Amino acid sequence: GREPAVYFKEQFLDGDGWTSRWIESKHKSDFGKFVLSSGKFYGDEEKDKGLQTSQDARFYALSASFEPFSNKGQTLVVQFTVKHEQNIDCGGGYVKLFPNSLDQTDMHGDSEYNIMFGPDICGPGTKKVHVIFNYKGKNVLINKDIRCKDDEFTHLYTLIVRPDNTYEVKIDNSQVESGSLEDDWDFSIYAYDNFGVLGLDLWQVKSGTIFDNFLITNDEAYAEEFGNETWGVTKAAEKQMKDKQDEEQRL
Ligand SMILES: [Ca+2]
């Protein structure tokens, strides 16, 4: 049978239909709720709908399952958009890729995972992109400092992992970091037997972040193409709308 290039895609285009694809963890009874919204300003009111954190000072735990796969002998790409529309003080904006053994109804901050990737902000001192590989019972952190975006607009985050043990990180479809797994972490290191769930495990103080346009693919050129069709289409119209609102607030 024909092998797919896309393992997972989520754009939230079918209204409340997303609730059949994403599971809320019940690990705690006080997790915050994600709501479907395109927010105060956006590129397109319908296309720019995504998952938005709705409660301040709260832990979040929501995840989506997909047909399990292995990245052995292939490239792996994880990509999504993050929009901290609230002008965030402190909060996570990263994803985790888990093996199929994860119980989605029990997912939490300390559940075992394979890879963690994305922006984390906590005051001026923490504006970073995490790139964590689980290896031989340790969650190994990248030894390179990658600065994340901190404004109110939609930004595209991309992690590419290749079978030659090389990686690349992109922000807004432009390279920000690259190198070898052997050099940039203190460890087939690239390869995982099973990926089955993508999860949002976050802590936020000022809530309101919107997540959209998730993609997991073995095709790095396609991730760039989809990036331009999503974040690339949102960008200019979103900036025009916020500039217009700031002009209304000014007066
Ligand atoms: Ca969307």
Author numbering: 16 to 202, 304 to 367
Task: Give the published text.
shown to play a key role in the MHC class I assembly pathway. cellular processes with broad patho-physiological implications. GSG linker and the C-terminal residues 369–417 were deleted. The long C-terminal α3 helix is kinked at Thr346.
to two different crystal forms in our study. yielded similar structures, except for their N-terminal extension.
